[PDB]
Amino acid sequence: VRRFPWWWPFLRR
């Protein structure tokens, strides 16, 4: 699906 950028479930962590 989709509901985020992609790099974002990365910078947050």
Side-chain angles (χ1 to χ4, degrees), residues 4 7-13:
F4 62 105
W7 49 262
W8 105 281
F10 179 50
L11 86 169
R12 55 169 181 177
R13 289 290 181 294

Side-chain angles (χ1 to χ4, degrees), residues 1-9:
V1 295
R2 186 182 65 65
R3 51 179 177 181
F4 62 105
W6 69 260
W7 49 262
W8 105 281

